[PDB]
Amino acid sequence: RCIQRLAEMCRSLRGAARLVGEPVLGAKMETAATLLRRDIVFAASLYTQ
Amino acid sequence: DRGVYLSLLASLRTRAQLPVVVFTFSRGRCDEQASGLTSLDLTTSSEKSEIHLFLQRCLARLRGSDRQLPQVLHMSELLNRGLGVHHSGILPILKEIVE
Amino acid sequence: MTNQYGILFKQEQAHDDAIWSVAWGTNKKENSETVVTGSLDDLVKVWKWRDERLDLQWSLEGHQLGVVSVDISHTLPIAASSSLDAHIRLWDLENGKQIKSIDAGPVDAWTLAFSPDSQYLATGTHVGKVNIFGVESGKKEYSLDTRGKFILSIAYSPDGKYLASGAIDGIINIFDIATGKLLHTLEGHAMPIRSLTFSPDSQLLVTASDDGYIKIYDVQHANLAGTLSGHASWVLNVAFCPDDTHFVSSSSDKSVKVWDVGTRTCVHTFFDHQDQVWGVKYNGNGSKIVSVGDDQEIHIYDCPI
Amino acid sequence: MTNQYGILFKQEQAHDDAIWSVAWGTNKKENSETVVTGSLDDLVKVWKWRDERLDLQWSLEGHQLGVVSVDISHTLPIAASSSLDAHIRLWDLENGKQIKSIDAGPVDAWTLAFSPDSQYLATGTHVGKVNIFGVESGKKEYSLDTRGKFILSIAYSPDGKYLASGAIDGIINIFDIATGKLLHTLEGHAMPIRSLTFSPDSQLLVTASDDGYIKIYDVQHANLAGTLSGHASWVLNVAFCPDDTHFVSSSSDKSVKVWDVGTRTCVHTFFDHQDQVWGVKYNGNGSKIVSVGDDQEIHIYDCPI
Amino acid sequence: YDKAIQAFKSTPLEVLEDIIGFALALFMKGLYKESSKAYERALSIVESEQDKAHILTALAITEYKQGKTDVAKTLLFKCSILKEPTTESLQALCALGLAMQDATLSKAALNELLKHIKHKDSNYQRCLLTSAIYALQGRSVAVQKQISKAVHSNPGDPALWSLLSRVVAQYAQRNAKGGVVAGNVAHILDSNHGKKALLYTAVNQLAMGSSSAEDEKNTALKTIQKAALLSPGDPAIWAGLMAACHADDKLALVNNTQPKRIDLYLALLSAVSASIKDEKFFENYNQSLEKWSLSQAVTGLIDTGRISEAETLCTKNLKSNPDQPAVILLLRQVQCKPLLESQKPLPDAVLEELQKTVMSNSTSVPAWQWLAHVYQSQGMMRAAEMCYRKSLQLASQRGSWSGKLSSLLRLALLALKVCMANISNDHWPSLVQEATTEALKLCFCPLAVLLQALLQFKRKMGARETRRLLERVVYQPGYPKSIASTARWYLLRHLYAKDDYELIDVLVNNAKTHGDTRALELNQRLSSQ
Amino acid sequence: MMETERLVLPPPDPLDLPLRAVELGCTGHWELLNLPGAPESSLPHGLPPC
RNA sequence: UUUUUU
């Protein structure tokens, strides 16, 4: 639950660093997000599919 | 508490009031008595087959290492007999199968 | 903010060795959904995605060495395959039996591509030309010529009138099928290309070279609209979605990415394969992706519209 | 009368080319003192320390490229040798008869070390795994692995439940043999290791570096309790003695220095071995020292207790 | 280059950059004297002595091209006399030394390079120069040892592993298995070294033979195909493919299941030639590759059975150029295949012609072995022996090793076959003895020991020594199936000669614990005579 | 070249086996085929120059 | 010692 609640905040910071004008935080938060969601932590819910 | 639950389930199986939802108030006790109950086997053979087919079809999407680790195996063992636990400290993929 | 992507089915061991190419065809007017795959064998197995799973239908085979390219047709039930065997034998897909066999060596064919109307079956040669054979009508009416090197990738625009060809060493050539005259030659990348694709309505040509970049050119001029760099090794295929908004790329770093051309960014990455991924395709109304890999497996994903 | 460390022997041409691994086994309490060496000529030779000298017992073979590591077992008379083609042999050491030949794939094994009761024969791997092959009965009993680079040197704790593994990047991983759960990772250096040695009553761990420094660590923590700065060029091998008092080191600058933990100074330095030294070892007590260099000479020094 | 020269013309050539560029363009086109003049002119106006050393090295290279190695050498020494060498003058000096077949200065240059230069970070070029120096002296085993040393120092570096595999394929191809492992390691440790590493591991697998567990997915054919998919540009992959197809056919024939992959030789030859045409220059290597590919294609076509295509291919090649004594032998071979396939006697005129043609191209053990086979076919045994002897003498002088063993074993087979016929002039056993002793002197050839067993059984059939030798051949493991079966079969017949039913059933269980059809069936046939 | 002819009995005994020697690879590895015919080495011209 | 969301 903590990892799921972090990969969803390191993605609204990708949206705010693009708004402030920080293109190096955008390129680091867009990496820290894609390396954080790979496996059973992000398994699709049975109900949804 | 182990004898209390086995005497309750003995008086509960004699009648048809079987699908009983225990409400515990802390997760360690919650998985503790589900581990400690350890012999009911309330399920027939065809229910064994359907439980096994459904759980294998839903669990066989994900990869190798992720499908043999302690909770998955332990919960599958309990579910085989027809028992589940549903506290807040288990993977959502197991809450959804139990539900 | 992205959508819900995910696996639906996983064939465990389709062939006995690496799988080198895949084609998905919604050929029949009804819901057939036939998938044809070729491997480092003689086998050209013909699968069918019926409702929720793939059931093997044909295991047809006549080849001697590994198959390097397979193709399917949208009008007729038919398929074509080429190999290191110097033969282009084209199958039937209905009774599972060979129809023809064309003799052509690594100097006459490397990779296959049918016409939009399933009539011509162009292939790329070694000496630089593109050879256009004739299905059901014999062999080798004419060959387009580009004064270049070994040619790896061949693409046909969906509406006709355009044929594109990548090569070892990078250069890209665009011909028009109407007259057979070279429109213009792009200089592109600096390493082999080995995959190309137009977009539906044919105004956007997407390459994928050996250095990791994905150029997005624009047809009818020489404009390029950007360079997509998000892989970590070679890029081996690019398939463009039925609606002109996304495309899928499989690389030799064991990863299938889904891009969108509006903002030139990667929406979702699939980390499910365990070895090089040699083939990706969409299906009909593009909402599922097939991916054949170096480890013998067939993945089918779910990309909701 | 001071008994100073003396050269006391030289054997001019032990092998035909460079010598790479030396092991000293006092298995028999009687006059056996077996010394075994592997030397890039694909020969593993067994020598014995008879009265004051080395007399060859036998030279035994079967190895494709040069031999990289040899080991002698304390409990039973038995030897083990690995080479560059990742192929492991066990030698009888009573007849020279190759008891067992543990094979291995392209990337399985680099160096070797027995278990204290001579049962497991742990070995490193080009891609980071530390898989263990049960002696004389089993193959690939299990594979204890981390994520990391090439792993040059591997040590086994004397008492047990410890296994320290250096890496080419320069980091140390120590694993408890009970279950395989990494105890703690030491950053180490920024250059490869090439040697790891424990102590009897194993509380101190000594690491050799490729920059010439030697680092002393305490097993209970990551306390970098030491640093020694005498060797000019790389350091290739470090060994202790049956008492926790001092150790020998073998640089790549053609010098063997004997350091002490108590005072952290070089009590003595040896000047032999025209070319660089690749191995050093101590016998069943502190008396005698064996050094094998790149030049084809075996040296046996003396160092009173 | 002409456009470049014209462009450099339309400027005042007064700064170092313009003069240097002009010089390189001039050198590229030809015109070495002009480039030398321009480089000297650039040398006049020079600061930053690194550039002075580089200009001196360029001068040495450009005049070397014309010839005049003496002046190039002195100019490179002059460059060395500067305050600090550049690691580029040293490498050029080593290569210049290697271009003249003398290792005196090359060793000195290499030691100089090693001595005080560590900031170079290639680590592959130094190994290549060191190995080339050792190969110059003809050592040919030291080379592999030197590369093994280099790989021991830096176990990373895919390039080093790949080079070790290549060297094992070229020099000392008796560590074929180790080479296969080295190529596999190089391919694993990266992806972009795939191309060369797969080529070299495939060639090593070809050299090895079939020394595996008859496992699929890792045979020579599979690896060469993987390499062909990775890089379809070099001609070596196509030649390797031709060799792999032929070897697979022979292995299937040994296993006796089915020949497969029959007719593609002409297409592969076309691919090889087309691919060579676009390679810049390794002239000797390209010529060698094309010659080997042509010969292999003709032989493959003859074996499969398409004689006519082989004939037309050879004739076209001769129609291209005046005769070269290699291809004419191929034409002779294709000519003389129908005849002697059906029994026929050949006339001394044709036979003498063939012998004369073989002397044309000497220094080739294959040719001599083929001629000896022809003599044996008609039956002129002693002449066959002489031709085989010439092949052995030639092979031993060349330092090759496979040819020596092949010739010796072939001669032993000739003598044993002559003995089989119950011929008088009891001298063929003596020839068998000498050939087999030499064969065992080289190695541990199972065929040689079975051949001795057959000689012993045939000559002085006897009771004990023959059975002992045969049983030793058939009972210790590590022997091929076919050889074990033949020794077993003769031992069964002889063991039946000296009746012991117990021992015969022991032989039966030995057959049972393996797979056989013929020994036990013959035993069934001869249990009730 | 001394005899110029040899006459031999080709089916000397029908029980025994003719010896067919097939050569596999450059490192010595031979095998025995059953049916009679030519020697049939593998890679007759040697290894391809790589 | 229970429970939770942008």
Residue numbers in the entry:
A (entry chain A): 1198 to 1246
B (entry chain A): 550 to 648
C (entry chain C), D (entry chain D): 1 to 305
E (entry chain B): 1036 to 1564
F (entry chain A): 1 to 50
Passage from the reporting paper:
The superkiller (SKI) complex is the cytoplasmic co-factor and regulator of the RNA-degrading exosome. In human cells, the SKI complex functions mainly in co-translational surveillance-decay pathways, and its malfunction is linked to a severe congenital disorder, the trichohepatoenteric syndrome.
For the structural analysis, we incubated wild-type recombinant hSKI with a 25-uracil (25U) RNA substrate and the nonhydrolyzable nucleotide analog ADP-BeF (which mimics a prehydrolytic ATP state). The cryo-EM reconstruction revealed well-defined density for six ribonucleotides (N1–N6) bound in hSKI2cat in a single-stranded conformation. hSKI2cat has the characteristic domain organization of DExH helicases: a pair of RecA domains (RecA1 and RecA2) contain the ATPase catalytic site and are juxtaposed to a helical domain, resulting in an overall globular shape with a central channel (Ozgur et al., 2015). The 5′ nucleotide (N1) binds at the top surface of hSKI2cat, where it engages in base-stacking interactions with the so-called melting hairpin of RecA2. In particular, a Trp-Gly motif (W146-G147) in the hSKI2N wedge segment contacts the 3′ hydroxyl group of the N6 ribonucleotide enclosed in the helicase channel. The interactions suggest the presence of a crosstalk between the hSKI2N wedge loop in the gatekeeping module and the 3′ end of an RNA substrate while in the hSKI2cat core, rationalizing the presence of a single class of particles/states during 3D refinement of the RNA-bound data set as compared with the different subsets of closed and open states in the apo hSKI reconstructions.
